Amino acid sequence: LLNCFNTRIKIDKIYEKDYWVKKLGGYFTTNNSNKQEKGEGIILSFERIL
Amino acid sequence: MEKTYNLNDILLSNEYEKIKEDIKEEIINDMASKKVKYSNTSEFAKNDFLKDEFIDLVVDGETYEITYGNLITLLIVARPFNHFKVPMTEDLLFDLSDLKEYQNYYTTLLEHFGYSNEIKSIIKDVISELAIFSGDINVTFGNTVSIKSLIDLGNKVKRFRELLHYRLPNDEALEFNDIEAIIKKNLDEIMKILSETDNMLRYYIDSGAGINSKQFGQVLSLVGSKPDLFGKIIPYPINTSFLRGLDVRSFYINALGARKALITNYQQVRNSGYLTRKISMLLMDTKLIDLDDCGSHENNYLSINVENKDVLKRFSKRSYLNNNGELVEIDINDESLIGQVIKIPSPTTCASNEGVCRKCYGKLFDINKDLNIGMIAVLLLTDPLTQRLLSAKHLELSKPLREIKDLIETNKYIKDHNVNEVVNYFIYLLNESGINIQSVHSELIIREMMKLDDSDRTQFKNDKMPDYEIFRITDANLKGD
Numbered sequence A: 001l002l003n004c005f006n007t008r009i010k011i012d013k014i015y016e017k018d019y020w021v022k023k024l025g026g027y028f029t030t031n032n033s034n035k036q037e038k039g040e041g042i043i044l045s046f047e048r049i050l
Numbered sequence B: 001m002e003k004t005y006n007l008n009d010i011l012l013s014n015e016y017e018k019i020k021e022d023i024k025e026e027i028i029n030d031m032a033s034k035k036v037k038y039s040n041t042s043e044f045a046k047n048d049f050l051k052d053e054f055i056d057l058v059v060d061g062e063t064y065e066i067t068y069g070n071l072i073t074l075l076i077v078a079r080p081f082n083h084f085k086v087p088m089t090e091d092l093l094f095d096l097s098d099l100k101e102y103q104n105y106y107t108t109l110l111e112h113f114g115y116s117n118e119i120k121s122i123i124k125d126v127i128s129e130l131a132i133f134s135g136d137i138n139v140t141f142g143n144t145v146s147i148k149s150l151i152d153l154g155n156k157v158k159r160f161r162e163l164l165h166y167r168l169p170n171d172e173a174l175e176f177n178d179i180e181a182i183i184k185k186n187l188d189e190i191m192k193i194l195s196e197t198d199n200m201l202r203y204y205i206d207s208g209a210g211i212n213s214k215q216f217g218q219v220l221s222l223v224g225s226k227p228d229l230f231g232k233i234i235p236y237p238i239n240t241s242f243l244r245g246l247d248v249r250s251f252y253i254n255a256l257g258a259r260k261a262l263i264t265n266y267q268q269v270r271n272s273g274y275l276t277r278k279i280s281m282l283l284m285d286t287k288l289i290d291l292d293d294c295g296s297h298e299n300n301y302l303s304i305n306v307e308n309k310d311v312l313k314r315f316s317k318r319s320y321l322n323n324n325g326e327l328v329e330i331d332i333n334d335e336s337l338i339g340q341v342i343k344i345p346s347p348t349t350c351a352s353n354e355g356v357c358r359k360c361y362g363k364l365f366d367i368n369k370d371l372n373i374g375m376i377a378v379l380l381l382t383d384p385l386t387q388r389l390l391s392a393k394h395l396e397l398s399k400p401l402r403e404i405k406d407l408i409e410t411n412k413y414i415k416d417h418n419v420n421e422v423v424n425y426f427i428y429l430l431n432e433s434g435i436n437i438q439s440v441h442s443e444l445i446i447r448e449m450m451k452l453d454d455s456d457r458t459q460f461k462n463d464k465m466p467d468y469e470i471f472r473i474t475d476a477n478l479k480g481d
């Protein structure tokens, strides 16, 4: 949890899901403008794993 | 010469050019007839010149005492009113003896007649006619330089003789700062003596034409201390004037500097200019929209700190949120806004994807609409920076230039700071370096560097500040993919 929380965060976004989706997407895609889409796609693949 | 001239009667007459012609002809013919007399003292010598005689000028019923020369200058520079047939209000009259004010008068002409091409043509004709007459003045009045001119003043004014023959005290207690202080004290006196006496060099000193302070004092009074090859000040100063001669030791010190100047110009050849192409690429596409209000929230408006007088100057012709109301143009002359953070509509925060609005860009919208706005910004920043880097090599003075580049071309400060902090850092960097740019142009560069994380252009009207990420100038080009 502490590793997930970087110091450069605002408390308002912590309770916002789409910020976390974008954070997940950022690992796979460098561009900050498409991050959200990648994250959502990754979630689908995650569900396909099992 | 006639002793009463009605301004707007001649300007709105169809004999406007003929009146100037005969006055211009009369003034130059007078100058050819008589010589100029010099007394080389504070009690000036008398000369019977028409340019210096007085006439009465009637502007809308009000009489001003104006010299014949100021009249012909006024008529030449009031050509707009003959062309447009619109009279000259007394607001537009200015001091015709201080040539600095002419620039501002041309500025008021541009605003009054609407920044049109027609007024742009007339100003060009005014500058042309003013210059052509200057040659006639110069070829008839005459201008000369002589060492006898210096000798003639010193024979009457003992202070000139004593400064022309000045030699430093040989105390070892004197230091580089003490000698440089004596340099200003005796040079400031020299220029004052030349302005307050009837000498052949008086018009040079008062006009500011062909006069450089340092080099003037080295010929007349004292050269001073000089740096060596690597910048260290040589312990021995040059206690002579070029007019009086130099010492063999001093000759070596001068040759060291002249050689150093030559070596420096060889090093100065370096001109990378890589940033010029990068900044131009991002900003070339930015355009303007004929929309008065894009629609933005005051918290989304940019906030800037007016710490210095230099800060307010950068934000002229732009909007400001007064404490009583909202959206009033900031007056740079009012120092009341110094020390107050203020909310400004910014080209960074303009909502419309097509272009930046008239309130966020500023009042320069109609002035710079014909040209490419982004390209105007890149040249206003590049030409100083490229020139400042080269000029600094000759002399912490070089450091501002590097930090300016690091701010926009590296992610050192981009990744951990907001745009409100980024633009204010930019104006701080420009102020220290001496770069004079209105902040709208610098903000447009930051606007394209700024890339929205949210990826929605019109979300700016929402009170919540949009999610975004600033990027490096080369990285922002790469992010397009």
Ligand SMILES: [Zn+2]
Pocket (backbone or CB within 6 Å): B294, B295, B296, B345, B346, B347, B349, B350, B351, B352, B356, B357, B359, B360, B361
């Ligand atoms: Zn706008």
